[PDB]
Design an enzyme around this catalytic site. Structure first.
Site, PDB file in Angstrom:
ATOM      1  N   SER A 293       1.441   6.827   0.479  1.00  0.00           N
ATOM      2  CA  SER A 293       0.608   5.905   1.232  1.00  0.00           C
ATOM      3  C   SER A 293      -0.767   5.845   0.581  1.00  0.00           C
ATOM      4  O   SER A 293      -0.968   6.319  -0.540  1.00  0.00           O
ATOM      5  CB  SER A 293       0.501   6.326   2.696  1.00  0.00           C
ATOM      6  N   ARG A 294      -1.716   5.219   1.276  1.00  0.00           N
ATOM      7  CA  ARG A 294      -3.085   5.152   0.784  1.00  0.00           C
ATOM      8  C   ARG A 294      -4.052   5.998   1.600  1.00  0.00           C
ATOM      9  O   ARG A 294      -4.704   6.893   1.057  1.00  0.00           O
ATOM     10  CB  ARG A 294      -3.556   3.695   0.751  1.00  0.00           C
ATOM     11  N   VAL A 295      -4.139   5.746   2.904  1.00  0.00           N
ATOM     12  CA  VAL A 295      -5.306   6.181   3.664  1.00  0.00           C
ATOM     13  C   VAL A 295      -5.165   7.615   4.174  1.00  0.00           C
ATOM     14  O   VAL A 295      -6.180   8.253   4.491  1.00  0.00           O
ATOM     15  CB  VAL A 295      -5.570   5.175   4.802  1.00  0.00           C
TER      16      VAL A 295
ATOM     17  N   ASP B 203       0.816  -1.200   0.000  1.00  0.00           N
ATOM     18  CA  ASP B 203       0.000   0.000   0.000  1.00  0.00           C
ATOM     19  C   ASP B 203       0.854   1.256   0.000  1.00  0.00           C
ATOM     20  O   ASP B 203       0.591   2.190  -0.766  1.00  0.00           O
ATOM     21  CB  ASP B 203      -0.924  -0.028   1.211  1.00  0.00           C
TER      22      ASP B 203
END
Ligand code: ATP
Ligand code: ATP
Ligand code: ADP
Ligand code: MG
Ligand code: MG
Lengths: 539, 478, 523
Positions: free
Chosen positions: C389-391, C364
Site C-alpha cells: 500500500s502507500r499510506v 496505490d
C-alpha cells in the site's frame, strides 16, 4: 493571418493555414473553449496544415473554430517569484494564488548546451542513505537515476532525497511532476509547507522550490512537456542567477510514454515492442539539456518507473546510457522486507573509482560487491545443502553477508509517518569504517536483525543490547500481571457508561442542495438552422 | 527543391530532378541534409540537426556531392561532430582533406592474412581472447560493465606503446562515440589529454542530443577517418562504442521514412548497413599500401541475451566476442571475460610468441577450472587433483585483474601469467594479497623485459634466468 | 504542380466562352429531370456514408465536436469520437442494424450525460442512463459531465479514513484508504468479485451505525459480465438489503462496445456527486480489463494505429483519468471522498501484461490473488509478500495498527522458511516455531464467502494469534475455534474497542483474560 482547426482525431488536432505556416514547436490558441488550449505543432501534413498535440482535452473542438498564432514556442513565466508556486505546463497557476509574480517569459524549447561549456569536476554528493553514499555515490551537479517497479519504493526515496539534500542546500530547487499520482503530488505540497520549503503569505520570495506538475490526469500533450517546463525554469536559474538548482523530476518513463501514446497518432509506424520510433531524440534531447556547465550547476534527480522489473524494454534501456548514478530498486530486497531495497549489484554510480574519492571508499564498496555477489551465487545452493559441509571457510562470507543486506536499511524521515521508527541523517566517513567493520569481522559477534533499520556503528551495537535484554525479558508467566482486576481495572460494563451518544437519523441528508430537476423523456436534437427541436419522427 | 511536408527530422521535398542517392543537400537556414530515399513525386530528405527551422515552402539546394568528411592528420586531438565539423571550440580543422564516406570495402586481393598482433593492455584481452592488427573483435556486454573501459584502456596502452615504437607501426586511435552523453565525452577528452593520448586520438562524438542521422553517420565518418590511416600505410585503431545506438539511429530514420519494417521493427537492410561499416577495416597487402585497420565495435545487450537481433548481426559479421557480463563483474574478475563464452576466431594464429606457449595452456587450464567451477562453493574435498586445479583456477582469477585506466606494457603481462601457470604461485594465504600480485612485475630486473620485446619469444637462453628471477620473489610484507 | 498554380487556376484565362452560355441553360432542366435521385445538401445535420458493427462514418456535420452525443433517425444514440476531414467517425451506442446508407444523423449538441443524484440509490441502469431494473425512469436526478477532469492538487487533502472492508485478509494485511486507489489484480475465477462484494455488505451493515459523515455509498460497475451474473448480484444486494445504498451500472457483453466503454466513466459520474456533497463513496470498476477490450474494439474499427497487443496508444490515458477523478477533497469542498477498486484479470499470470503494467502503476495498492493460493485453503487468496500500500499507518484500525507490525514481520520470515521444507530440519526451536506460527497464521486468516465481519471483532481476532491462546492448537481446527473465540467472549467488549479505536492499557487487561476464559475445540 490565422487559421482554423480542420480535423480532430482524439488528442491530436489538425490546423490548416492560409499562408505563412507556423514554425515547428510553436504555440497555438483556440478561442471559445472552456480552458485556454495550447497546441504544439509536431509535423507539417503538407497541404498547408500543421499537426498538433493537445495540452488539455480536445472534447469540445468544433471543426473550423478560430485558431490564432502566437508565432513562438511555449512560454512559461520564469523568475524568482515562481518559487512557492504549483505550475502547469503552459504557465498557469494551479495553486489558485493570483497570477505568477514574475516576468521575462522564455521559450521552453531550445537546443542543448554545447560541448565546450561542459563541467568535468566531480564532487561527491553525500545524501544520508547508507546504501547510496557507500555503494552508488551521487555527483554534485551530476545525474541521479531511480529505476524499479510499481510498488518497490521509488517515490518515497525521492521525497527522502529532498529532505536530505534539497533542505540542506539553502538555494533553489524544482520538483518536476511528470505523470505521477496526484496523491504523491498533493501530499508533497503539505509536507513542504510544514517543512517550510514553500511558504504562504508575504514571505513568498524566500522559498526554495517551484512545483511543475503534469500529473496523470492530463492528456499526453501535458505529460510530454512538463519535463521541459520543469527543465527550463531550472535552466533559467542556472545561467542567469548562477545558483545550484536541484531538479527533482518524477517518472521520466511517463515522459517517454506520453510521447509514445500519440507518436503512432501523428502518422508514424511503431518501433520495437510498441514504443515510439523517435525515442532517441526525444529522451536524448531531454537528458543532455540537464547538465552542469561553467556558468552554474544543475543536479538532476530522475525517478523512472520500469514495468515489472524488466530492463530489456527499450524505453528504460535508453535511459541507462543517460544516467551517471543509478539507484536500481529490486522488488526482491523489498520482498525481504528491507527498505531501501537498493540493489548492491544493479545500482552502480560513476563516482566509484579510487582515482577520485580515495582508496578507503572504493575498497569497502568493492569488498561489499565481493561478499554480496557470492552470497547470490551461494543462496541458490543453500537450498540444496543447507550450509553444513562448507568446512568453515565459506561460512564467514555468508554470515556477514546475511548481516550486510540488513545494513543497507535505514528508517526514513518521510516514512516514519507509517513505520514508526525515527529517521537518520547518516554521514559518510562514520559508516564507511562501519561498513568496513562488518565486512572484516569486528561485528561477527552480533545476531541477525540488529543490523536492520539502523544508522552508524553505535546504533548497531545498541540494537543488540536491547535485543539481548529482550531475550532475557519475557521470562515470567505466573501472576502479578495486568490481567487481574485488583490494581486499577474497572468492570467491563463501567467502560460502557462513558460512551458518547451517537445520533442516527435514517434519512442521511441527501435533499438539501441537490437541485432535483427533471430530464427529458424524449431526446432533444437540433435542426439544420441550429435551433433545439425534438426528434422528427421518421426513419 | 521545395518542401511539401517536414516533421521529426524528416523533410519530404518536391523537385530536385537530379539529386543522387545519398547526396548531401543544404537547406535555407544553414542546416544540411541527406536524401536517402528518392520516390516518384517527392524526395525524402533526412536532416542533420534541429528541424524546427524549416517551414513548408522553404528551399533546398543540392551540393552535387555525396556526404563527405574532412580526413587527415590535422584532426588529431580534435573533437568533431560526425558530419565533419568541430565542436571542441578550437576553430576549424586545418591540414585535412575531405573524402567520401561511402565507398566499398577492400576486396580479396587487397587482403593479406593478419599475422602480427595488436596489443591492448588488458591482459585478459591479450592472452585469453587475442586480437591481431587488422582484425574485427566485438566488445559485447551489459551496461555499467566496462565496455568503454576495455576500449579506453586499449587506447592508453597505445600511447604507452607508441612512445617506444618507430614511426611506421604506431597505432592511431579513433574512438567513435555514438549515443554517449555530451558530458561523458568531456571526461573522455580529459583522459586523453591528461595522459597525453590526444597527440594520437580523434574523438568523434555524435551525442544522444543531436539528431538521428548524425548518430547514423558517425561510424561511417569515423571509419572514413580510419581510411586515411590505412592507405598511408600506418596502423590504426578504430573503435565504435555502443553500436546498438547506431542501430537505434538507423531504426529511427527508417520507420520515419516509411521504409518496410522487419525483425523488431528495424529495417531489413540494417545487416547490410552494419556490414559495410565493419568490413571496411582490414589489413591491406604489401602491394597496395601494407597498412592495417582493426575495428572494435561495441554492442550493449540487455541481460546477456547474445541472440537478440542486433547482436545476432554483429556477431555474425565480426570474428569473435569479448563477452563482458555484469554479474561476474562483482565477482572480482576484472574484466568479467567469460572465457567459456568469449572466443576470438584467430586464437593462437595471430599472437606474439612470448604468449603463444603460455596462452596455449591458459585456455586449457581455464577449461579445467570452468568445468569445475561449481566446486569452489563446496568445502568437502575431492581427490586434490581437482582442488589444486581449483586453486590453479583461483589464482588465475586474480592473475587477470586489471586496474582501471592503467594498461600495463606488453612484455610485462607475458611473464606475469608465466608466474602463475608454471607454478610460482601464492601458496601462502590471502590475508596478504597486496604483495602477492605486484611482486613478480616489480621485483625482477628490467633487463628481462628488454630481451622479450626484441626476440619475440622466450628463447632457451632466458628461462634459466626467468626461473631464477621468479624464485626470488621477495614479498617484504609477510 | 503547387498551390500557387492552383491559385493561378483561380484566375480565369479561358480566352473564349462558347460553352458557358449554353451549359448554363441545360443545367437546370438536367438537375430537375433527375431531381428524385437527389438527397438534399446537408450542412449542420449528418447523413451516413458507411455503417457497420458500432462504427458509422457520417458525412457533413460541420457543427459537432469531439464527444458530442448524436442521435440517429431511429432513436439510436451515438458519439463522435474522431472527426476526419470530410466525414465524422461516429461510434454507435447499442445494436446498429437499423442504420442504412442515407439515413439522417441528428446532433444533440451536449457532451454525453448520464443522470446523477441520490434518487438513483436502488436503481440499475446501463452506461447510458436508461433503466433496466423494471422500475421506470429515474426520479429526483440530474445530468452531469462524464468527461470532467480530476480534482486538482489544491483541491485534495491527506487521506485519513481507513475504509474498513470487513475482511481480516484485507484490513490487517493491506492498509486501504478512503481516497486510496486499491487494485484487485488476479487470475480468472479466483475471488475478485468476492473481495469487492465483501466490502459493500460490510459497508451496508456499518452504514446503519456511523453518523452521516463516514457513510460510504457504493456504485458497482459491471463491465461485460453476463446478465445472469447481473441478476445474481441484484439478488445478492436485495436479499441482504444492500440495494438501498447501492447503485449498479451494468454493461453486459451482449451490448455494444461504447456502452461498455462508457460504463466505468458513467460509473464514476454517479460517485463524484457523493464526493462533491461531502459524503464518502465506494466504487468498484469490475472487469476493467474487459472495459479496455471494449476500448480496443472501437479503435481498431476506427482506422486508428495499434500498439502493444493491438491496444491503441492512449490506453494509459483512458485508465488514468478513469482513476484520477476518485479522490479525497480538502476541507474547502465538503471533505468528500472516493475510494477505487479496479479489477484486472491477468492472462493466467502475466504481470507484464500491457493493461496490467498501466493499472499497477496508476493505483496505490494492489492485491494479488493467484490460483495457487486459492487451492491451499487460503480463501480469500491474498498474496502477502507481493501486496503493498502507500499510506500505511492512519489507514488501518489504530489498535490493529500496533499489532499489524507483529503480524506482517512474522509473516515475512515465514514465507522464506516455507519453501525450505525439503530436508526435515526443524532445528533450534526457531526453524520449527516460525513454521508453527505462520502456518496457524494462514489457518487464522481464512474466512467465508459473503460473510462481512466488522473490524472490532477482527482486532480481537487478530489478537488471538499474535499473543498466546493458540500455542497449543492444531493446524486443522482453527477455522472452527475462531468462532468460539468470538462467541464465548462477552459481546460488549467489541463495542467499547470500536468506541475507543486504539489498544489502550486500560482495555488491554480485559483482552488477555477473556481469551483464556474461552476454551478451544481444536483437540
Ligand atoms: N577495473 C575496474 N575497477 C573498478 N571499477 C571499474 C573497473 N573497470 C570499470 N569499472 C567501472 O565501470 C564504470 C563505467 O565504466 P565503462 O563506461 O567502461 O562501463 P560501460 O560498460 O561502458 O558502462 P555504460 O555502457 O553504461 O557506459 C565505472 O563506474 C567504473 O567504476
Ligand atoms: N473467499 C472465498 N471462499 C470460498 N470460495 C470462493 C471465495 N472466493 C471465490 N470463491 C469461489 O470462486 C468462484 C468465483 O468467485 P468470484 O466471482 O469472486 O471470482 P472472480 O475471479 O471475481 O471471477 P471472475 O473472474 O469470473 O469475475 C465462486 O463460485 C466461489 O465458488
Ligand atoms: N524506507 C522505507 N520505509 C517505509 N516504507 C517504505 C520504505 N521504502 C519503501 N517503502 C514502501 O514502499 C511503498 C511504495 O512506495 P512508492 O515510492 O510509492 O512506490 P512506487 O514508486 O513504485 O509507486 C510505499 O508504500 C512505502 O511504504
Ligand atoms: Mg558504455
Ligand atoms: Mg466474478
Amino acid at each position: 493571418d490565422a487559421g482554423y482547426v480542420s480535423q480532430v482525431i482524439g488528442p491530436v488536432v489538425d490546423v490548416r493555414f492560409d499562408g505563412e505556416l507556423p514554425s515547428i514547436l510553436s504555440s497555438l490558441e483556440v478561442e471559445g473553449h472552456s480552458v485556454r488550449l495550447v497546441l504544439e505543432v509536431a509535423q507539417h501534413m503538407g497541404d498547408n496544415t500543421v499537426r498538433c498535440i493537445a495540452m488539455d482535452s480536445t472534447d469540445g473542438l468544433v471543426r473550423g473554430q478560430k485558431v490564432v498564432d502566437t508565432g513562438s514556442p511555449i512560454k512559461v513565466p520564469v523568475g524568482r517569484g515562481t518559487l512557492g508556486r504549483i505550475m502547469n505546463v503552459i504557465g498557469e497557476p494551479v495553486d489558485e494564488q493570483g497570477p505568477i509574480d514574475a516576468a521575462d517569459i522564455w521559450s521552453i524549447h531550445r537546443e542543448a548546451p554545447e560541448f565546450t561549456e561542459q563541467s568535468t569536476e566531480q564532487e561527491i554528493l553525500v545524501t544520508g542513505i547508507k546504501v547510496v553514499d557507500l555503494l552508488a555515490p551521487y555527483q554534485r551537479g551530476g545525474k541521479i537515476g531511480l529505476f524499479g517497479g510499481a510498488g518497490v519504493g521509488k517515490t518515497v526515496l525521492i521525497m527522502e532525497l529532498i529532505n536530505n539534500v534539497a533542505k540542506a542546500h539553502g538555494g533553489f530547487s524544482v520538483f518536476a511532476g511528470v505523470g505521477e499520482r496526484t496523491r504523491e503530488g498533493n501530499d508533497l505540497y503539505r509536507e513542504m509547507i510544514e517543512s517550510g520549503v514553500i511558504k504562504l503569505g508575504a514571505e513568498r520570495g524566500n522559498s526554495k522550490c517551484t512545483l511543475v506538475y503534469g500529473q496523470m490526469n492530463e492528456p499526453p500533450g501535458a505529460r510530454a512537456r512538463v519535463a521541459l517546463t520543469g527543465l527550463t525554469v531550472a535552466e533559467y536559474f542556472r545561467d542567469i542567477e548562477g545558483q545550484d538548482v536541484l531538479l527533482f523530476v518524477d517518472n521520466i518513463f511517463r515522459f517517454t510514454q506520453a510521447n509514445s501514446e500519440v507518436s503512432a497518432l501523428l502518422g508514424r509506424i511503431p518501433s520495437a515492442v510498441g514504443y515510439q520510433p523517435t525515442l532517441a531524440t526525444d529522451l536524448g534531447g531531454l537528458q543532455e539539456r540537464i547538465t552542469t556547465t561553467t556558468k552554474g550547476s544543475i543536479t538532476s534527480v530522475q525517478a523512472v518507473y520500469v514495468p515489472a522489473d524488466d530492463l530489456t524494454d527499450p524505453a528504460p534501456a535508453t535511459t541507462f546510457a543517460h544516467l551517471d548514478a543509478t539507484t536500481v530498486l529490486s522488488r526482491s530486497i523489498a520482498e525481504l522486507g528491507i527498505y531501501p531495497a537498493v540493489d548492491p549489484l544493479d545500482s552502480t554510480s560513476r563516482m566509484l573509482n579510487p582515482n577520485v574519492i580515495g582508496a578507503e571508499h572504493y575498497n569497502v564498496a568493492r569488498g561489499v560487491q565481493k561478499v554480496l555477489q557470492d552470497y547470490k551465487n551461494l543462496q541458490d545452493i543453500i537450498a540444496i545443502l543447507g550450509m553444513d559441509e562448507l568446512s568453515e571457510e565459506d561460512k564467514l562470507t555468508v554470515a556477514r553477508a546475511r548481516k550486510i543486506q540488513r545494513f543497507l536499511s535505514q528508517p526514513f524521515q518521510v516514512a516514519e509517518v507509517f513505520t514508526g521508527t525515527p529517521g537518520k541523517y547518516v554521514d559518510l566517513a562514520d559508516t564507511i569504517s562501519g561498513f568496513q567493520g562488518v565486512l572484516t569481522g569486528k561485528y561477527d559477534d552480533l545476531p541477525e536483525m540488529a543490523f536492520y533499520m539502523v544508522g552508524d556503528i553505535k546504533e548497531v551495537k545498541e540494537k543488540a543490547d536491547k535485543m539481548a535484554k529482550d531475550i532475557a525479558s519475557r521470562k515470567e508467566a505466573d501472576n502479578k500481571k495486568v490481567s487481574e482486576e485488583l490494581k486499577d481495572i474497572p468492570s467491563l460494563d463501567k467502560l460502557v457508561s462513558e460512551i458518547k451518544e451517537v445520533v442516527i437519523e435514517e434519512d442521511d441528508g441527501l435533499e438539501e442542495d441537490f437541485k432535483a430537476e427533471a430530464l427529458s423523456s424524449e431526446t432533444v436534437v437540433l435542426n439544420e438552422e441550429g435551433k433545439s427541436v425534438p426528434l422528427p419522427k421518421k426513419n | 527543391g521545395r518542401v511539401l511536408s517536414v516533421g521529426d527530422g524528416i523533410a519530404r521535398v518536391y523537385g530536385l530532378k537530379s539529386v543522387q542517392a545519398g547526396e548531401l543537400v543544404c537547406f535555407d537556414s544553414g542546416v544540411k541534409g541527406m536524401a536517402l530515399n528518392l520516390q516518384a513525386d517527392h524526395v525524402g530528405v533526412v536532416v542533420f540537426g534541429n528541424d524546427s527551422v524549416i517551414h513548408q515552402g522553404d528551399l533546398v539546394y543540392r551540393t552535387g556531392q555525396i556526404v563527405n568528411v574532412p580526413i587527415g592528420p590535422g584532426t588529431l586531438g580534435r573533437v568533431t561532430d560526425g558530419l565533419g565539423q568541430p565542436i571542441d571550440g578550437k576553430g576549424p580543422l586545418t591540414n585535412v582533406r575531405s573524402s567520401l564516406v561511402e565507398v566499398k570495402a577492400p576486396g580479396i586481393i587487397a587482403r593479406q592474412s593478419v599475422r602480427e598482433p595488436l596489443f591492448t593492455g588488458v591482459k585478459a584481452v591479450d592472452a585469453l581472447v587475442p586480437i591481431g592488427r587488422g582484425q574485427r573483435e566485438l566488445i559485447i556486454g551489459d551496461r555499467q560493465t566496462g565496455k568503454t573501459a576495455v576500449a579506453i584502456d586499449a587506447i592508453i596502452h597505445q600511447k604507452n606503446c607508441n612512445e617506444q615504437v618507430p614511426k611506421a607501426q604506431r597505432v592511431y586511435c579513433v574512438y567513435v562515440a555514438v549515443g554517449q552523453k555530451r558530458s561523458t565525452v568531456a571526461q573522455l577528452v580529459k583522459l586523453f589529454t591528461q595522459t597525453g593520448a590526444m597527440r594520437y586520438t580523434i574523438m568523434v562524438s555524435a551525442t544522444a542530443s543531436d539528431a538521428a542521422p548524425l548518430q547514423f553517420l558517425a561510424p561511417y565518418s569515423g571509419c572514413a577517418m580510419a581510411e586515411y590511416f590505412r592507405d598511408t600505410g600506418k596502423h590504426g585503431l578504430i573503435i565504435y562504442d555502443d553500436l546498438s545506438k547506431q542501430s537505434v539511429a538507423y531504426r529511427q530514420m527508417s520507420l520515419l521514412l516509411r521504409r518496410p519494417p522487419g525483425r523488431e521493427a528495424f529495417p531489413g537492410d540494417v545487416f547490410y548497413l552494419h556490414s559495410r561499416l565493419l568490413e571496411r577495416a582490414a589489413k591491406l597487402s604489401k602491394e597496395l599500401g601494407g597498412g592495417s585497420l582493426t575495428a572494435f565495435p561495441v554492442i550493449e545487450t540487455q541481460a546477456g541475451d547474445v541472440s537478440a537481433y542486433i547482436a545476432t548481426n554483429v556477431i555474425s559479421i565480426t570474428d569473435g566476442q569479448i563477452f563482458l557480463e555484469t554479474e561476474l563483474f562483482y565477482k572480482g574478475i576484472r574484466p568479467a571475460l567469460n572465457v567459456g563464452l568469449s572466443v576470438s576466431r584467430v586464437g593462437s594464429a595471430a599472437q606474439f610468441p612470448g604468449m603463444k606457449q603460455v596462452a596455449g595452456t591458459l585456455k586449457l587450464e581455464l577449461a579445467q577450472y570452468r568445468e569445475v567451477a561449481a566446486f569452489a562453493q563446496f568445502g568437502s574435498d575431492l581427490d586434490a587433483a581437482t582442488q589444486y586445479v581449483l586453486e590453479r583456477g583461483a589464482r588465475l582469477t586474480e592473475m587477470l585483474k586489471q586496474k582501471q585506466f592503467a594498461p600495463i606494457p606488453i612484455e610485462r603481462q607475458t611473464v606475469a601469467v608465466y608466474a602463475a601457470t608454471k607454478g610460482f604461485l601464492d601458496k601462502v594465504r590471502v590475508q596478504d594479497i597486496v604483495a602477492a600480485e605486484e611482486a613478480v612485475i616489480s621485483q625482477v630486473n628490467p633487463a628481462v623485459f628488454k630481451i622479450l620485446k626484441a626476440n619475440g619469444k622466450i628463447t632457451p637462453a632466458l628461462d634459466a634466468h626467468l626461473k631464477a628471477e621468479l624464485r626470488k620473489v621477495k614479498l617484504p610484507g609477510a
